[PDB]
Short mmCIF file of C-alpha atoms and ligand atoms in Angstrom, two decimals:
data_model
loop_
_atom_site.label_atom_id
_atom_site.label_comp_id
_atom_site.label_asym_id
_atom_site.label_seq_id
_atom_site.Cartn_x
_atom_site.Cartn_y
_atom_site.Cartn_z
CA UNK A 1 110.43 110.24 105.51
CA UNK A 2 109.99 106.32 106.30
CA UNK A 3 107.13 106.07 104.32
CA UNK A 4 105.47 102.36 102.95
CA UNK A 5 102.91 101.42 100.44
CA UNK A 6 100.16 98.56 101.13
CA UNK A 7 97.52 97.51 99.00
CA UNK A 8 94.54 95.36 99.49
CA UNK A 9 92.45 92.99 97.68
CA UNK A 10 89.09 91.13 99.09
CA UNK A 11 86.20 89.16 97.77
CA UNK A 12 83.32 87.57 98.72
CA UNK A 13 80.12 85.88 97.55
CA UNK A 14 76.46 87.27 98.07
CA UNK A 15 74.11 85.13 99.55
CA UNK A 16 70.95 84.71 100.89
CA UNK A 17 69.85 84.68 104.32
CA UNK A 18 72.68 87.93 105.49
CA UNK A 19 72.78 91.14 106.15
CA UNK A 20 75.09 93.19 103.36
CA UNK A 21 77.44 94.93 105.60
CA UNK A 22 80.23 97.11 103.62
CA UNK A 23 82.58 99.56 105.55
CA UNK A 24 80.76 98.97 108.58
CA UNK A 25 77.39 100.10 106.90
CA UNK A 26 74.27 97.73 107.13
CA UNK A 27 72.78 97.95 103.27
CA UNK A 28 69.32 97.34 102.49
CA UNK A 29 69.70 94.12 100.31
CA UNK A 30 67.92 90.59 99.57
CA UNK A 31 71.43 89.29 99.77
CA UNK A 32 74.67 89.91 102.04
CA UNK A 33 78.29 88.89 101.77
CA UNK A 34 79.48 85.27 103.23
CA UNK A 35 82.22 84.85 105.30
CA UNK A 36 83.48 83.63 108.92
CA UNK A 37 83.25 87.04 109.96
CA UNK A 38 80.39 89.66 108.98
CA UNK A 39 82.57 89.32 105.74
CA UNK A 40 83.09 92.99 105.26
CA UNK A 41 84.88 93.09 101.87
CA UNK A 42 86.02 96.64 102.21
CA UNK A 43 87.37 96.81 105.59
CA UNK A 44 89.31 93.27 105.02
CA UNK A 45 90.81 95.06 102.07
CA UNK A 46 91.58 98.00 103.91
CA UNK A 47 93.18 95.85 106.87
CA UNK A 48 95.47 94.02 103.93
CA UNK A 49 96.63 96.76 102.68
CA UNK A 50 97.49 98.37 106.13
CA UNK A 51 99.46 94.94 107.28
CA UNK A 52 101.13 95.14 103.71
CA UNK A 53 102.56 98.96 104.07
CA UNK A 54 103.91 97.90 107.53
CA UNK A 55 105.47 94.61 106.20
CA UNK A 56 103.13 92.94 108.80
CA UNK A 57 101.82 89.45 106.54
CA UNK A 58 98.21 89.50 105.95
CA UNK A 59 94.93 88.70 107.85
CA UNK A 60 95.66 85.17 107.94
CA UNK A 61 98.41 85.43 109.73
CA UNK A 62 96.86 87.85 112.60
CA UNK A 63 93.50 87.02 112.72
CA UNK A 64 89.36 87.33 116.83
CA UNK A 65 86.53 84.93 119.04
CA UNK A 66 83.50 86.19 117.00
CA UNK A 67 84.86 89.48 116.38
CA UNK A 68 83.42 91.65 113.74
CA UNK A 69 85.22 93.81 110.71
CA UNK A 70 85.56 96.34 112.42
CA UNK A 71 86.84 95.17 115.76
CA UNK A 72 89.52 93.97 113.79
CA UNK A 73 90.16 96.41 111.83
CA UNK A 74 90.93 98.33 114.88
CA UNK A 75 93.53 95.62 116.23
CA UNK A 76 94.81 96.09 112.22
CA UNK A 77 95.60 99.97 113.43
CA UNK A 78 96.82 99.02 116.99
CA UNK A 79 99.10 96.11 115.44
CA UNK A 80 100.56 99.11 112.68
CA UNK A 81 101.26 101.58 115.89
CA UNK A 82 102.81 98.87 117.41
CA UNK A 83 105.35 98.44 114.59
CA UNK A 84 106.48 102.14 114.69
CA UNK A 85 103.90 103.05 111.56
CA UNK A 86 101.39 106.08 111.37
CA UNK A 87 98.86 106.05 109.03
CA UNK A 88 98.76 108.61 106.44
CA UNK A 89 95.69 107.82 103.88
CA UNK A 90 93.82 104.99 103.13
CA UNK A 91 91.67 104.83 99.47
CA UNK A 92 89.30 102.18 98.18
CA UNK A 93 87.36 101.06 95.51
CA UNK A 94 84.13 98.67 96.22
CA UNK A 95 83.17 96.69 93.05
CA UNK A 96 79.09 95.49 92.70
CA UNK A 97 76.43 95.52 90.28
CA UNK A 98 74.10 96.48 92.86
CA UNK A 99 72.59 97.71 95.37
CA UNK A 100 73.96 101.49 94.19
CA UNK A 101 76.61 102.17 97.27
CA UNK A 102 76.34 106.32 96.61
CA UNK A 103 73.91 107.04 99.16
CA UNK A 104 76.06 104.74 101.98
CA UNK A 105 80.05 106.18 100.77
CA UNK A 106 79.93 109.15 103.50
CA UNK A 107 78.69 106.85 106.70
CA UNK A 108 82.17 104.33 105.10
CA UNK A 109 84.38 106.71 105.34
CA UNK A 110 82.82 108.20 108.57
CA UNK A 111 83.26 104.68 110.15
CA UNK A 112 86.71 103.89 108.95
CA UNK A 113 87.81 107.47 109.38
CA UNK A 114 87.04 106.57 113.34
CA UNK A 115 88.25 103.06 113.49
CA UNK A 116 91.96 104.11 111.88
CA UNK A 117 92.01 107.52 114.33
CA UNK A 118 92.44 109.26 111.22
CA UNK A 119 90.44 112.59 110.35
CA UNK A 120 88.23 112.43 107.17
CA UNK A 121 90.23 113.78 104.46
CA UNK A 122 92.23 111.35 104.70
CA UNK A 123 89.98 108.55 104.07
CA UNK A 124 88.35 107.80 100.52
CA UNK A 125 85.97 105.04 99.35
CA UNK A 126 85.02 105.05 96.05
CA UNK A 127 82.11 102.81 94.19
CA UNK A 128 82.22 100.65 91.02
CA UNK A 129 79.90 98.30 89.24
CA UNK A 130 81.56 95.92 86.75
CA UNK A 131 79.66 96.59 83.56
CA UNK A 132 77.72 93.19 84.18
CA UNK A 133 80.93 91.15 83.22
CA UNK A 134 81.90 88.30 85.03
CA UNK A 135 80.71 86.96 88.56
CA UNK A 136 80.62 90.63 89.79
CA UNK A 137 78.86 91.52 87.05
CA UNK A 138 76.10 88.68 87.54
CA UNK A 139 75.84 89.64 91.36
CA UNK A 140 77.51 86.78 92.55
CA UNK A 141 80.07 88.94 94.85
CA UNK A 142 81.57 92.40 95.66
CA UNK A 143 84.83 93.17 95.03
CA UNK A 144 86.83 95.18 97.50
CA UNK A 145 90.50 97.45 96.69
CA UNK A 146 92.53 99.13 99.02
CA UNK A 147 95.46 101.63 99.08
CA UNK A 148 97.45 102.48 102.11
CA UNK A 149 100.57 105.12 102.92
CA UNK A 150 101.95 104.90 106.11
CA UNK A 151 105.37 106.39 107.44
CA UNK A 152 107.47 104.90 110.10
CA UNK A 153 108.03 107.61 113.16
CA UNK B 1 105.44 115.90 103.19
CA UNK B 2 101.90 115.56 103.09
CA UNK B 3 102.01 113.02 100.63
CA UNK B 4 98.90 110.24 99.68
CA UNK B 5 98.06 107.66 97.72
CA UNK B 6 95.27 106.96 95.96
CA UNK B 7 94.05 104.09 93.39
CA UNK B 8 91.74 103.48 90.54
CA UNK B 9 89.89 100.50 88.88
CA UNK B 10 87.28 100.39 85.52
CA UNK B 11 86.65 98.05 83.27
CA UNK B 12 84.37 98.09 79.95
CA UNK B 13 82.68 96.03 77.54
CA UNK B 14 84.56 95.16 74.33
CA UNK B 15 81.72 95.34 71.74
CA UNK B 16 81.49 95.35 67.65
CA UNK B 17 80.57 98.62 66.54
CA UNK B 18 82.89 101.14 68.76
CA UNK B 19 85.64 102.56 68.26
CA UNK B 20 88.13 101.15 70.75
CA UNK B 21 89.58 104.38 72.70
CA UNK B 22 92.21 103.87 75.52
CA UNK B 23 94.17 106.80 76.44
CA UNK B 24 92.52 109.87 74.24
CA UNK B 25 94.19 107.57 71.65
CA UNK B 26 92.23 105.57 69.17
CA UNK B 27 93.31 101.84 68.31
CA UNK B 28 91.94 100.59 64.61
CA UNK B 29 90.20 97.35 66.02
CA UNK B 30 87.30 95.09 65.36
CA UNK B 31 86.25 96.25 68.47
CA UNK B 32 85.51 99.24 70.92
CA UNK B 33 84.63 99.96 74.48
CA UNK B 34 80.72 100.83 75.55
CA UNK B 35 80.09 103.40 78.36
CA UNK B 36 78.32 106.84 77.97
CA UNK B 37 81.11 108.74 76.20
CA UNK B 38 83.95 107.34 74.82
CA UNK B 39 84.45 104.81 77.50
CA UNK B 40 87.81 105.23 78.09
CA UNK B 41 88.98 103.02 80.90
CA UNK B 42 92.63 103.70 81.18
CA UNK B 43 91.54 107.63 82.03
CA UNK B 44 88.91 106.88 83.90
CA UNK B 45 90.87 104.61 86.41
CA UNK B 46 93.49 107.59 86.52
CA UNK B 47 91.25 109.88 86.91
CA UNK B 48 89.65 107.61 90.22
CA UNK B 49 92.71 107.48 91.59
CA UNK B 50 93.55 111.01 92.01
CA UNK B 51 90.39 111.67 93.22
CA UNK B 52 91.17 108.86 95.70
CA UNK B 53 94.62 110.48 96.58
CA UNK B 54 92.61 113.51 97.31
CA UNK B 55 90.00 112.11 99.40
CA UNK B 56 87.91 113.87 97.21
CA UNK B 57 85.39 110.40 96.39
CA UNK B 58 84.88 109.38 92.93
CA UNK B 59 83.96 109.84 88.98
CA UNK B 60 80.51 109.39 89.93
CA UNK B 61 80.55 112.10 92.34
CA UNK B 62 81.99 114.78 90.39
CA UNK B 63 80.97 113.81 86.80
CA UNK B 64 82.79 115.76 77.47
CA UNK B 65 85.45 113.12 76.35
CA UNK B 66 87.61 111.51 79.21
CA UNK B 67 90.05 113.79 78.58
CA UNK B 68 88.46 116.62 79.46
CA UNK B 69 87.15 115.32 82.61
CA UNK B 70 90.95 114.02 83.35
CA UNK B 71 92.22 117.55 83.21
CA UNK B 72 88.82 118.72 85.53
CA UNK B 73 89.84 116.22 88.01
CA UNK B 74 93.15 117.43 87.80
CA UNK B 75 91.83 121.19 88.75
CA UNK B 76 90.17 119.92 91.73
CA UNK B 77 92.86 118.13 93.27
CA UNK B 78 95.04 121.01 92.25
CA UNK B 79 92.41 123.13 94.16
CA UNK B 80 91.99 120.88 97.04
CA UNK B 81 95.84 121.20 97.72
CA UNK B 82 97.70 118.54 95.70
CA UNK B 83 100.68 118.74 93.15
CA UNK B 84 100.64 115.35 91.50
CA UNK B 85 104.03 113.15 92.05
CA UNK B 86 103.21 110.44 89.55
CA UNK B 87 100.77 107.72 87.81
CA UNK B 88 101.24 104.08 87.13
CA UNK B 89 98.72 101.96 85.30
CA UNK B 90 98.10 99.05 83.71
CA UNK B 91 95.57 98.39 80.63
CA UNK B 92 94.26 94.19 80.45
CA UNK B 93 93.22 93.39 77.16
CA UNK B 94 93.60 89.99 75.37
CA UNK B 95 93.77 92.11 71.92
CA UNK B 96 95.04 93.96 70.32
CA UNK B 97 98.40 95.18 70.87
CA UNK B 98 98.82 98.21 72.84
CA UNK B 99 103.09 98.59 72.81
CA UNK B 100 102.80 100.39 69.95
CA UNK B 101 100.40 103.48 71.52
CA UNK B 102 101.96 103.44 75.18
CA UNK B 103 104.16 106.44 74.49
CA UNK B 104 100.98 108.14 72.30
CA UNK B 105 98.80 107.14 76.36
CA UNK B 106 101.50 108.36 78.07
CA UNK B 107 102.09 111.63 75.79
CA UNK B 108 98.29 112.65 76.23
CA UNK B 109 97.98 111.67 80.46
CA UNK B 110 101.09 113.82 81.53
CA UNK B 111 99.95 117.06 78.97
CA UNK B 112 96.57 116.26 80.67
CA UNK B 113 98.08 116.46 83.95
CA UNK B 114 100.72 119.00 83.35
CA UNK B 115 103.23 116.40 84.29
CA UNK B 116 106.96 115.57 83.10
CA UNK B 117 106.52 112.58 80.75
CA UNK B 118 108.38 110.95 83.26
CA UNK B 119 106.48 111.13 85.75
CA UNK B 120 103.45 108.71 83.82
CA UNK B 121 103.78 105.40 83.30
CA UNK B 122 101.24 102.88 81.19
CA UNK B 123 101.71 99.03 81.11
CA UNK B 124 100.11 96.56 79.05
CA UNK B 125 99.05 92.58 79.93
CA UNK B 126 97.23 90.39 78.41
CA UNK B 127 94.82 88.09 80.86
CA UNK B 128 96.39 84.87 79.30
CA UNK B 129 93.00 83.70 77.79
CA UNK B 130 91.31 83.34 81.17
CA UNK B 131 88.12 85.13 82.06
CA UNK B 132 85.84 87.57 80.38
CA UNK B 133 89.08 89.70 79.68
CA UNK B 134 91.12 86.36 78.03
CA UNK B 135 88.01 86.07 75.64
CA UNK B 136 88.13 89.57 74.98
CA UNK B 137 85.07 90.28 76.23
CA UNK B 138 85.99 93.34 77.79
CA UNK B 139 89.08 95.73 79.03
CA UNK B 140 90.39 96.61 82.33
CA UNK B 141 92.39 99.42 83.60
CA UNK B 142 93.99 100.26 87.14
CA UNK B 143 95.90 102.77 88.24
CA UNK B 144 98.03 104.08 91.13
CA UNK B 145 98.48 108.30 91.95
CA UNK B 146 100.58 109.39 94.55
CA UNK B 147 100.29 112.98 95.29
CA UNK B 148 101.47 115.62 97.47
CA UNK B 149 100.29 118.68 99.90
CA UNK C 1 111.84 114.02 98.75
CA UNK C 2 111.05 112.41 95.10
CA UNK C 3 108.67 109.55 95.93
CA UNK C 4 106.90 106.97 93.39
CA UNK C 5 104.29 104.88 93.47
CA UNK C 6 104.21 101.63 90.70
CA UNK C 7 101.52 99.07 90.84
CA UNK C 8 101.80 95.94 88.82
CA UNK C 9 99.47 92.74 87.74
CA UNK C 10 99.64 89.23 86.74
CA UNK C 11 97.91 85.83 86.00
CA UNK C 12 98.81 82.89 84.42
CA UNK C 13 97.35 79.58 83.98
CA UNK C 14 97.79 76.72 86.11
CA UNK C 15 98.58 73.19 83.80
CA UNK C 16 99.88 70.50 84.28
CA UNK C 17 103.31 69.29 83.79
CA UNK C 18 104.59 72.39 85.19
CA UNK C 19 106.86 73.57 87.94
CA UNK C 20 105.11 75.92 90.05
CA UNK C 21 107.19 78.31 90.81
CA UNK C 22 105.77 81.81 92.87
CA UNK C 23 108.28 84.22 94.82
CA UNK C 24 111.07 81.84 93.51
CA UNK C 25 110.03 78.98 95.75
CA UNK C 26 109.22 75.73 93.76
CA UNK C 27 106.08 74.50 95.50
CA UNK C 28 105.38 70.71 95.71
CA UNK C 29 102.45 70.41 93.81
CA UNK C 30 101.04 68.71 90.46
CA UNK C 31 100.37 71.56 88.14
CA UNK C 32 102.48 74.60 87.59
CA UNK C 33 102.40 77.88 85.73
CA UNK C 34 102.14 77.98 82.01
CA UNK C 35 104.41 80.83 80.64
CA UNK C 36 107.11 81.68 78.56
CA UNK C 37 109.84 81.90 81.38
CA UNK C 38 109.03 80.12 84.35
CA UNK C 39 105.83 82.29 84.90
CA UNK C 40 106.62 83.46 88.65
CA UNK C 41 103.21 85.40 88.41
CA UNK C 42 104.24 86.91 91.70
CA UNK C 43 107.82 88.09 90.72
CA UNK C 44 106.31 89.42 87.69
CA UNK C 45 103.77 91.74 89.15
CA UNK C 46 106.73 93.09 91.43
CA UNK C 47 108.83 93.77 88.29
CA UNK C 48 105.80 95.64 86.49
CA UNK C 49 105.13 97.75 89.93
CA UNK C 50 109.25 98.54 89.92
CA UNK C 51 109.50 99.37 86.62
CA UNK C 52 105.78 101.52 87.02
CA UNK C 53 106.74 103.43 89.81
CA UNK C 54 110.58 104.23 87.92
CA UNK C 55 108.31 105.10 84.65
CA UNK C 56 110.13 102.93 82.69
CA UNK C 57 107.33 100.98 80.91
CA UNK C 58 106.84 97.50 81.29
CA UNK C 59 108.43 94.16 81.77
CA UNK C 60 107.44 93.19 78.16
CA UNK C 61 109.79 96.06 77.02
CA UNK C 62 112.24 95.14 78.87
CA UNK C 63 111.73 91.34 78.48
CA UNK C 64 110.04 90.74 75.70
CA UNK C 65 107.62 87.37 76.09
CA UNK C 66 108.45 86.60 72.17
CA UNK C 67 112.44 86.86 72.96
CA UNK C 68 113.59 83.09 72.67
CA UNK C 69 116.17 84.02 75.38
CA UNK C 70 113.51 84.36 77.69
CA UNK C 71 112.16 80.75 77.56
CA UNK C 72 112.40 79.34 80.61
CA UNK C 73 114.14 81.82 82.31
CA UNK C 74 114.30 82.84 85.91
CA UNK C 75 112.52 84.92 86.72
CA UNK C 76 114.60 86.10 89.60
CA UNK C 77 117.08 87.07 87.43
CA UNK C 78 114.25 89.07 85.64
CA UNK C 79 113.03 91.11 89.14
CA UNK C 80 116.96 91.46 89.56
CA UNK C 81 118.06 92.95 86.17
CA UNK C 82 115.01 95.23 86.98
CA UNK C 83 115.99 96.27 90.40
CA UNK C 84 119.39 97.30 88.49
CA UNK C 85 117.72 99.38 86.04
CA UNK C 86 115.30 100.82 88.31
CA UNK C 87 118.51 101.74 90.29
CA UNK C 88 120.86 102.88 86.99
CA UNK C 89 117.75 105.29 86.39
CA UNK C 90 118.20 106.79 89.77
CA UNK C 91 115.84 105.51 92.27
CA UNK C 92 116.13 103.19 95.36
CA UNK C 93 113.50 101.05 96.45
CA UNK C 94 112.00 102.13 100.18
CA UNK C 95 109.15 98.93 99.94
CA UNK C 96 107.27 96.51 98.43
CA UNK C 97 103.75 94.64 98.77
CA UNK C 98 101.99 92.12 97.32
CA UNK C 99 98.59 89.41 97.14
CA UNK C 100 98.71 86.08 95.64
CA UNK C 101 94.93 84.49 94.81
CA UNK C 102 95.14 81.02 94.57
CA UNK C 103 92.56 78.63 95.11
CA UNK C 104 95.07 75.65 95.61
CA UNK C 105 97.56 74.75 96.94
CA UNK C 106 97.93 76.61 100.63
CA UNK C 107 100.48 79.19 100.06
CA UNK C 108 100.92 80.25 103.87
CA UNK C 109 103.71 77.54 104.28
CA UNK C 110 105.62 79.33 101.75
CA UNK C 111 105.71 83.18 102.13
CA UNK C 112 108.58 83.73 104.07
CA UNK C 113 110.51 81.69 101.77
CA UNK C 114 108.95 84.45 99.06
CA UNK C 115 109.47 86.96 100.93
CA UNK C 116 113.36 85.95 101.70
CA UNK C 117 113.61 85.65 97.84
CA UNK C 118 112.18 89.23 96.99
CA UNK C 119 114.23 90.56 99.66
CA UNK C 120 117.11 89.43 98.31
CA UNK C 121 117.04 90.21 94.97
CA UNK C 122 115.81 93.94 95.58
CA UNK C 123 118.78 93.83 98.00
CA UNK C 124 116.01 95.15 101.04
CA UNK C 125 115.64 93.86 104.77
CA UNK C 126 113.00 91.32 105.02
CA UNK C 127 110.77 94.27 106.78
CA UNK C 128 110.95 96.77 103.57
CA UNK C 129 109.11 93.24 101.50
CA UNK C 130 105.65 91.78 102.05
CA UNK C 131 104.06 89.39 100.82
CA UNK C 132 100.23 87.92 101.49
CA UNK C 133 97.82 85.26 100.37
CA UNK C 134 94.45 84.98 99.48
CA UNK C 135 91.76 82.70 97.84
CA UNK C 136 88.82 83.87 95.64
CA UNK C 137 86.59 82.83 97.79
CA UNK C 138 85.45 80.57 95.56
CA UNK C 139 84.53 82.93 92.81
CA UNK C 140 85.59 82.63 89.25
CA UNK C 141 88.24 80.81 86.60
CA UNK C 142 90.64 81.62 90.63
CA UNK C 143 88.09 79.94 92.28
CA UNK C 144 88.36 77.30 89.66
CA UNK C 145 91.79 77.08 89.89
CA UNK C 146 92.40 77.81 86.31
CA UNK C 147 94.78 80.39 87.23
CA UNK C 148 96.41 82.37 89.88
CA UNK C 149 96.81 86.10 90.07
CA UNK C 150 99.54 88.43 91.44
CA UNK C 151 99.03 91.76 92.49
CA UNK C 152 102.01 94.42 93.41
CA UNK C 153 102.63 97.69 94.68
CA UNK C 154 106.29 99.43 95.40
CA UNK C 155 107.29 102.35 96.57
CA UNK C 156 110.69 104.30 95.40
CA UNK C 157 112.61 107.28 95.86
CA UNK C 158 114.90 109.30 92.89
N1 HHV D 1 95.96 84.34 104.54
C1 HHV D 1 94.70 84.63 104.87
O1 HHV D 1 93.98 83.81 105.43
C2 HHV D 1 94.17 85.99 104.56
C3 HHV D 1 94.75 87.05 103.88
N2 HHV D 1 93.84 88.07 103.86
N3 HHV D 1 92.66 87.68 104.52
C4 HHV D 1 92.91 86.42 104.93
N4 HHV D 1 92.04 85.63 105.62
C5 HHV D 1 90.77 86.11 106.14
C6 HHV D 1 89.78 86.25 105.01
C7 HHV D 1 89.46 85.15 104.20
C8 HHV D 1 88.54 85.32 103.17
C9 HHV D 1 87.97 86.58 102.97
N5 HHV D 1 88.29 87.63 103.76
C10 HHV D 1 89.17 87.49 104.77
N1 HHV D 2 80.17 105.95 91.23
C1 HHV D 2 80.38 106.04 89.92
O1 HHV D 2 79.47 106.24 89.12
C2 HHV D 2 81.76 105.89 89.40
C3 HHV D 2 82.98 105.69 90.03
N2 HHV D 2 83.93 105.63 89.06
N3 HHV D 2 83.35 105.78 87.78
C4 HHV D 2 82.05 105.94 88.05
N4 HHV D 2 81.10 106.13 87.11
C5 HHV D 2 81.50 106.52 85.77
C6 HHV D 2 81.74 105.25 85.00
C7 HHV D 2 80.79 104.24 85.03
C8 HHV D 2 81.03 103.08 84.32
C9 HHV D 2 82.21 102.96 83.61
N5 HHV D 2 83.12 103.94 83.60
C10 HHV D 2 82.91 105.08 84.27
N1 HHV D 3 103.72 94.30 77.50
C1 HHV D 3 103.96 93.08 77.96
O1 HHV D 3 104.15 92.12 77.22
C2 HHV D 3 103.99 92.85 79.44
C3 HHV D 3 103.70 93.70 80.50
N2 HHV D 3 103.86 92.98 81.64
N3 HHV D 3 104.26 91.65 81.34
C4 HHV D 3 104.32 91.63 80.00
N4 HHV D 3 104.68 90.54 79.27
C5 HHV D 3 105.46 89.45 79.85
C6 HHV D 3 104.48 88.49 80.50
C7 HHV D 3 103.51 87.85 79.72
C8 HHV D 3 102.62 86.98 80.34
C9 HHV D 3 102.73 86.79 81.72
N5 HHV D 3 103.68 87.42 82.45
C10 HHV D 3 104.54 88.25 81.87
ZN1 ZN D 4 87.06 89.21 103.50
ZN1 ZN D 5 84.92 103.85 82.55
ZN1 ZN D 6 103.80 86.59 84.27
#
């Protein structure tokens, strides 16, 4: 009856020139997110909030040679077993004016569903635009939100 | 003990010539929020959350005032397996006041829910004058669900 | 078995001619955070997710921003007269989280210290109390460094 809350914040700026990679998914997109890594806004929100519900610090202080989001991610997951913590659900929220992220929300959740070792109702990812207000709103980034329950065994 | 979380985010455009609706309850302001209905982005964020508790996606997905689609959502997670714990939220606007209409919020999200009033929490910040909220260009809403098996 | 979730929010300003004061560490730097108390933007979204999760409103019921006996004050003191209500209405405090966004200064050097001070005050083992930083990636009045944000979650049991 351990259980821990995390949550998870992320953003970074589209660009030209790179591929749009959210939750793991490639997007078809002029533009694509910049960052040291593949800069995969919703699984570095996701990873936050995981470190945060097992008291763990943040990225920063964890984080792989060239790795991608994922890889890492999965690390996130071993590092949380490590500390005694199961995962219990994750939820999300991606924030862009476009592309439209419906048609990609199922492969997400597929992908972090199989990263955390967790079966698919227990993963959500939901999709936002931001009513064309502010830099999100103007395409200049994507906003990523995370929620995560874990339980110490 | 079963139990998940699950969060919610929306945010609208403050506009002359709306009523401003937060809630199911209507503020007198200047101002209200556009979106297809009645735009109301403190129920709309609740209602994302629960549907992210449930794994169940989104608004989008499944979707009348807000209200009605509140209590909807509530059916399907009810459905799906869930008895909701609790909500927590937070409303950003730069104006007006919202103090006076929490308990008014709160009243109409836990009959909505068929929760205890305790159970439902709303809290109101301003965005100290920075950003497209600080100029009152729009209002945000978040929320947090935890629910249970 | 009675588990609740709170989630809280804050921003202020960054001016000059302020301490800056976040997780109750004064940071060496040459603006600070303009508020009514001493606008801990980080101690305040903790104190809105405590008082969320408890149901018990907000911290601008409890401590009203246009209460002259609030100017200036500590906002430690604040996130502890919480934890006590939070506690008088029946629930203890199992965790908390948290993000800064800051575009300046580095923050990293400090979050233990925060995290020592949260602990403290919410009377929790430093592993029940997290704390982690971000930038804005450049984006916005954050990546501007007009302001810095504070985002919170806690979890507590009646
Ligand atoms: N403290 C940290 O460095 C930190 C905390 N969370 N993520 C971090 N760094 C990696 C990063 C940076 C920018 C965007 N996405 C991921
Ligand atoms: N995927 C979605 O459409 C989605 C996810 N959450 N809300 C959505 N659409 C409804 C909506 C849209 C804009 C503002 N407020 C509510
Ligand atoms: N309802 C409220 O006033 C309220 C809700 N949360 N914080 C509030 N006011 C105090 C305050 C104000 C500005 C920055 N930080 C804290
Ligand atoms: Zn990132
Ligand atoms: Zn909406
Ligand atoms: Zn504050």
């Amino acid at each position: 009856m351990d259980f821990r809350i995390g949550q998870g914040y992320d953003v970074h700026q589209l660009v030209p020139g790179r591929p749009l990679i959210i939750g793991g998914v490639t997007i078809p997109y002029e533009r694509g997110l910049l960052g040291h890594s593949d800069a995969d806004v919703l699984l570095h929100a996701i990873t936050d909030a995981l470190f945060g519900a097992a008291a763990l610090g943040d990225i920063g202080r964890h984080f792989f040679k060239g790795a991608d989001s994922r890889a890492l991610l999965r690390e996130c997951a071993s590092r949380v077993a490590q500390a005694g913590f199961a995962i219990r659900n994750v939820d999300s929220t991606i924030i862009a004016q476009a592309p439209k992220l419906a048609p990609h929300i199922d492969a997400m959740r597929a992908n972090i569903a199989a990263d955390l070792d967790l079966p698919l109702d227990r993963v959500n990812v939901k999709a936002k635009t931001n009513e064309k207000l502010g830099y999100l709103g103007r395409g200049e980034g994507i906003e990523a939100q995370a929620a995560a329950l874990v339980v110490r065994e």
